[PDB]
Symmetry: D2
Subunit: 248 residues, 4 copies
């Protein structure tokens, strides 16, 4: 086990990559504070964990609301005594819309969830970890944190911004035992990409060196490693899980 | 003359890098729409342009307000008939504050000006330029768009976000006559920077391979070149003007 | 056990990072072909592996000689029957010498070992792995594959070259069952580094966000993970183990 | 004029991007030392320059031979008194060959010309510039200095290596007034790409945001700017001229 005895929080854990991250953290021996804006999906992730003999609680949060992060910290300390690990996993892309046609609401919503929500989490997490001797934070960025993808200017800006805030936090808090890294998935086999046409999926697949999409466990495995004491010299860094996407 | 007969917009043109960009645009023959949140400062840059025989007007805009960008486009159209070039110069980093102590207001203000304001500007500028055959946009990022600087998490996030949205927009509009690139200054001898102790400047200087700080004209020269038809194969890219800061 | 039943080759395995990589591979259950230019050092690493109950052999190779790579493949095939994993660990930077004073012999030696030797190894390893269904290759680069370090132009060139050839090979062989990635250590507490003055180490330490040097096990842990089936969506990519060095 | 009164050397100047660089340097007012391994092509470039009223000489060099660089320096000092500017422009890709099939001679030849030849030039140039108060060096890298291109492992490694050696030289010599930068062209309309099929050229074109190939003047214009006093805060940096290639 990678994470025996450690307490981990995961945001956006009711579905997709966040759900797998939560399940993997618990399989690696972590106590997990599952969070999602959906109570139904969040509680289902919790039930998944408990059904496999893991230790977890569910706490609702809208990560775009600063105040909800304090409730997350509170839940961790109350259930498990300390926060060792946090994963800021978040929103989706939004709809594909050219920049000239992108509305204020699209820009604001994507920025809110995928960038501001990460800052608010990271700020609360740091505070908590500083009390119990440090810890490890992983921010889920994207390949869109390194390259651009047409139609999703807001997400690209957000995901780049996550890569940046990882860098400055690493230097601000490295002395004090907080590691922080970003993870950059490419296209992963989750709901949204499952609903598009075989032709479009083949097109996406062909943008990867491995010529397939990734699985959520392939991302989670990385996240779990970066969250572990095996990663103790790893901070301020972007870790792709991109099947070679960025390499061409 | 790199820019004879062109019409350029410069945001944050009231002082520092943005003032010099505006002057250098006029010196290279462009008509200039001077913008700034401060009307007094914006009017001053206009006065310096006009003093040398340049053609310019001033138009107030709060670039954090989406609607004010329409007034800038309109001013360009009213004074000179079209928009050929835009430089989104944006602002400053705010006070150095570690992430765990950075307030909601700090985060929201710096994001709003240095990231959202650039998106609202790029959006408006694309729309305008598409009416008359295209043009060139230069976004001023920072070294902070590529590395972290302790104490300015919000600015680092924003400036990384700027590098990302440049990439997307370049692919979205590359066939439609629009080039867009980002510029990454390091520490530049502005009035703000001038006042810090010879010791602290000696510390900033030593972070550059040239072992000095840059001048605003060294930034503006690059911006002018990137805005010109000499740069006709240059798009989607980040151009440091950093005296070697990123190279170590 | 990340690597049960796998057979791994490690070059430059006689000491430092390469010795620890080899041990950690054996500890994770792989058979290990130990290689090094120094037979005494290579035999020592073999002895430490065998002492713990690991399965290993030693095979001399000068990795700068293309033909010696054939002897390494053959040793893997003779002792364990196939090659599943290879780590091209390569060497050291040589003496710090400014570019204008760097000799032909310095340039040619460092390029030969740290760049050409990696290409000859990757070439041989690809050929071998293609015979039995594929495998995983990890190239040890450096922070010097992403930034410059004064006095080691040849090493900087080589280590950047390693990051590049990783990218190409990943696309060339990604459909044929081969993953390849690069690892970028910063300054690591090897015997070489251990002997430098507490002052000079304090200067190297301060260049890392963790404000210390790394341990060879912190590098090897990453290498082992990247060599394993947990890393099944990871290819073409650079994975720092740099304690935050690149983040400023 | 950008370069009035300055003396510039260009390598690989008998054809393609190097020839255009030479012609542009001379149009910008520089005295030019044209160099190529082909005397015939080299002398034709010289005649082009002289026919437009420029000042230049031709000096043969094989840039893979260290000794030939001393002859280049000697020619500059003898004809024009000093070296202000140098452009290390070089070889070609070689044949497209998968890594497992690439021979020792292919790896050695491409590395020799595109990497070692750049180091040997840079080493000689530094020495010369240090005598007359510094200057500016531009290294022609490629998009292959940032990404991988299947079939050209040697060129990818070489072009990455050029990006790296630019970084360390910038820091070693920034104090002493030497600027050094790399330029990264994408696919440019030169002989080799002119001879491939419309279908293949359309495929290449489609890898650029501008959806066309670049022209040699678009590259030279950049090189000339980076070689000029307008670029005085620009060093250690990679400047794409890639039509947006790297941005996706
Ligand atoms: Mg790409
Ligand atoms: Mg740095």
């Amino acid at each position: 086990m990678l994470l025996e005895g450690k307490t981990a929080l995961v945001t956006g854990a009711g579905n997709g990559i966040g759900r797998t991250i939560a399940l993997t953290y618990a399989a690696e021996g972590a106590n997990v504070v599952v969070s999602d804006i959906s109570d139904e999906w969040g509680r289902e992730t919790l039930a998944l964990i408990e059904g496999k003999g893991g230790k977890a609680v569910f706490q609702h949060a809208d990560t775009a609301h600063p105040e909800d992060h304090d409730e997350l910290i509170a839940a961790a300390k109350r259930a498990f005594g300390r926060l060792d690990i946090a994963c800021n996993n978040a929103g989706i892309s939004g709809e594909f819309t050219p920049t000239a046609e992108t509305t204020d609401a699209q820009w604001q919503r994507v920025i809110g969830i995928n960038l501001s929500g990460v800052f608010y989490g990271v700020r609360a997490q740091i505070r908590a970890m500083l009390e119990t001797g440090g810890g490890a934070i992983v921010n889920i960025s994207s390949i869109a944190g390194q390259i651009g993808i047409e139609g999703i200017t807001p997400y690209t800006a957000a995901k780049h911004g996550v890569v940046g805030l990882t860098k400055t936090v690493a230097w601000e808090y490295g002395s004090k035992g907080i590691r922080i890294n970003s993870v950059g998935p490419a296209f992963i086999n989750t709901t949204l990409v499952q609903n598009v046409p075989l032709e479009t999926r083949r097109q996406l697949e062909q943008m990867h060196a491995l010529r397939r999409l990734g699985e959520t466990e392939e991302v989670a495995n990385l996240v779990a490693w970066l969250s572990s004491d095996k990663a103790s010299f790893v901070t301020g860094s972007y870790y792709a899980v991109d099947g070679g996407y960025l390499a061409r």
